[PDB]
Design a protein around this ligand. Structure first.
Ligand SMILES: Cc1cc2nc3c(=O)[nH]c(=O)nc-3n(C[C@H](O)[C@H](O)[C@H](O)COP(=O)(O)O)c2cc1C
Ligand SMILES: Cc1cc2nc3c(=O)[nH]c(=O)nc-3n(C[C@H](O)[C@H](O)[C@H](O)COP(=O)(O)O)c2cc1C
Ligand SMILES: OC[C@H]1O[C@H](O)[C@H](O)[C@@H](O)[C@@H]1O
Ligand SMILES: OC[C@H]1O[C@H](O)[C@H](O)[C@@H](O)[C@@H]1O
Lengths: 393, 393
């Protein structure tokens, strides 16, 4: 593989699970704790991760997971992290369903300027029906319309980001000419979902414009991403389903005129790395055991895994399934390597809900990849595009 | 006066003027320059300013002032500054006319958590008619409706901020009870302008909720501010008009049940402080002279000031009127003191467009006020409410 592998670090505060917070190692306030977020981001930056990633949602109930009940908004925390990090990209989830594209176009570009070219947007059409009810609507649009809207939203957002050319801001104190009037472009969009005259009140960043990520996994979703995205997040249920998605998407991107190396595909994994197989397994177990089994049985009570498993352990493994990427550094490194060479992945988003994981990944797994020529020895540069391998538009 | 005087620092990048950027001392890129913003904020924090202030607008044309053409968005830059500052409040201008209150309620509270209780919102109904056309509307609502909407917006925003009680987040790892279900309040707003079910997905901050500022100067505006605001910005055309406004507003606040010391009134000044009267005056002049007089005459060509002024100097003084707060430290200190004792001001927002001003104010003027018992010797605490003198709701 000509290219290197890449990593992004998802920072999800107190984690993606109903009871993982109960572990002794976990700060149950992590989700609103600036320190937690800073240390993580600096660890990822130490491991030369290309970006940190913040996921997001806009609706809760009292049965939502603890993280979702009380956490940072994405652009605030990324902007804060911007000032205490040097090269790592800053990618954040924003819905096309609720915000005005001007508002968002601005906040992302502003981030991009603050950070000297490290912004990314995880564009998300947004699934929670109750979200509508937090934003003065009755209901979400139906799924297909959702993606129609997103196309228009993005197109406006990208239009605005091109309000100014890279060299518009001339700043001639002698002539009193601040900017070149020819290099300023009014969008004048009057579309179906949005009307936006422009121009945007901030110009081009050291990487041009932020990088687009996209999560979408449906037929519609893959097409959209294949068409519009610089990078795609996907799941990692298995090597083969992930090889499939990769194939399909890189194909559809060719069908849209695009060079497929221009689209980077990033499945999400949460490695549990330890010095021995039995330590890693301990850790898995401490966490899997945190759920009250009473809960766990029920959600089970709506595969063949008679592997000497008791009902309890099967109820537990449902609550908190075990990653393939468990165990020794070389095992984890090796899977990661195999997935890459198989063309299931161009890189991975690393979750690190369990305490120590992110730190252990960076410390033990990265050096191996570096040492086998699979991962760089230092940051390519200071923008998210340089580091990702993408060209400035 | 029982209370001390207070200051906020407006940071306006390359300034509020058409040609001030042309001065040799001015970085014409200041408006998108994170370094500029950081140094300013740290200077203000060194002078124990209660807050920094970022103004904002959402519409431009090619005849807009250079700052407005290309600058940071407010919540991004405040969030960035949050991580490099320790006690100074972080106040930002946000319109009620375009954003959804959930979006904003979140971003402000998130800021509040990041900063450990230093957020403020300058609530602004927003005047630029073309702004509507950047946010998929034909036109602004008429002025009165504008303030009806703002009342609902704010009320929702404050409702959401009360989604959780200060002690809701119990975090009992032993009992598996993350939060107290009784302490979680669904807003369920179905108003005229907005419908918002809630609850907000982030809870109470170390100062409860952010502080409300408000600029409004009309009959409607004063009433609104008097009713809703923790602090009010106003102009400083003259001592007497500012005494009037102060009077009127503190009065109307009594008419709304409120203790008027609970409302803090902050006129905006841009002092030009120097070691001698003639140096300060030089500086004024270098800047006033930057405008091409050709421009300057015209805007004149639609007072009695035969003060040996040539037409040129009158055209110039229109372009860039001279502050009362020009000259020596003790003069500036003394005016500031007189305005305070006259009850025109409880504090001031300090603009510092001219290079050195903010630095000179902090260095030369503050010590005098400190030394005459008018200004504290250190920060009262770490929240914007402590420092302002306000109680947590
Ligand atoms: C790494 C990764 C991150 C995701 N982050 C979010 C998120 O932040 N917010 C959200 O609403 N959905 C998120 N999703 C879920 C997607 O919305 C989902 O996988 C899928 O694409 C559903 O959309 P579709 O029906 O259009 O394809 C994420 C998915 C992946 C795999
Ligand atoms: C210190 C100060 C800051 C202001 N900042 C803004 C601003 O950031 N954005 C804006 O649109 N108007 C701003 N204004 C202008 C107000 O909108 C204006 O003074 C006035 O209240 C007009 O509103 P009204 O007709 O409702 O009273 C500011 C005013 C003052 C005095
Ligand atoms: O809040 C709900 C959402 O937010 C999270 O951040 C998740 O990653 C996403 O899959 C979920 O839909
Ligand atoms: O952008 C236009 C607006 O933005 C500025 O930040 C100003 O303070 C405000 O008075 C003006 O209305």
């Amino acid at each position: 593989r000509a290219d290197f592998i890449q990593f992004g670090a998802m920072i999800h505060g107190v984690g993606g699970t109903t009871d993982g917070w109960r572990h002794p190692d976990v700060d149950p306030s992590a989700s609103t704790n600036i320190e937690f977020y800073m240390k993580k981001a600096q660890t990822a930056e130490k491991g030369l991760f290309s970006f940190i990633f913040i996921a997001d949602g806009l609706f809760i109930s009292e049965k939502s997971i603890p993280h979702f009940l009380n956490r940072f908004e994405p652009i605030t925390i990324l902007s804060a992290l911007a000032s205490v990090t040097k090269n790592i990209g800053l990618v954040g989830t924003f819905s096309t369903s609720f915000t005005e594209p001007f508002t968002i176009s601005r906040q992302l570009m502003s981030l991009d300027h603050i950070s000297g070219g490290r912004a990314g947007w995880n564009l998300v059409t947004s699934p929670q029906e109750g979200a509508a009810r937090n934003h003065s609507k009755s209901n979400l649009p139906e799924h297909t319309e959702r993606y129609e809207i997103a196309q228009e939203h993005l197109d406006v957002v990208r239009g605005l980001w091109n309000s100014w050319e890279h060299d518009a801001f001339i700043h001639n104190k002698k002539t009193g000419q601040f900017f070149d009037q020819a290099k300023l472009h009014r969008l004048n969009h009057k579309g179906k979902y949005f009307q936006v005259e422009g121009p945007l009140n901030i110009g081009r960043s050291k990487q041009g414009e932020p990088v687009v990520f996209q999560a979408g996994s449906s037929e519609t979703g893959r097409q959209f991403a294949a068409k519009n995205a610089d990078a795609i997040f996907t799941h990692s249920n298995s090597l083969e389903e992930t090889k499939a998605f990769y194939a399909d998407v890189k194909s559809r991107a060719a069908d849209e005129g695009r060079d497929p190396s221009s689209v980077r595909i990033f499945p999400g994994i949460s490695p549990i790395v330890a010095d021995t197989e039995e330590e890693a397994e301990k850790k898995y177990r401490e966490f899997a055991e945190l759920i009250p089994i009473e809960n766990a049985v029920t959600y089970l009570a709506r595969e063949a895994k008679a592997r000497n498993l008791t009902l309890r352990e099967v109820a537990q493994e449902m609550a908190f399934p075990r990653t393939l990427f468990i165990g020794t550094p070389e095992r984890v490194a090796s899977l990661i390597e195999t997935w890459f060479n198989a063309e299931a992945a161009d890189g991975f988003i690393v979750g690190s809900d369990i305490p120590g994981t992110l730190d252990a990944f960076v410390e033990k797994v990265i050096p191996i990849l570096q040492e086998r020529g699979l991962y760089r020895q230092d940051y390519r540069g200071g923008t998210l595009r340089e580091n990702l391998g993408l060209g400035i538009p």
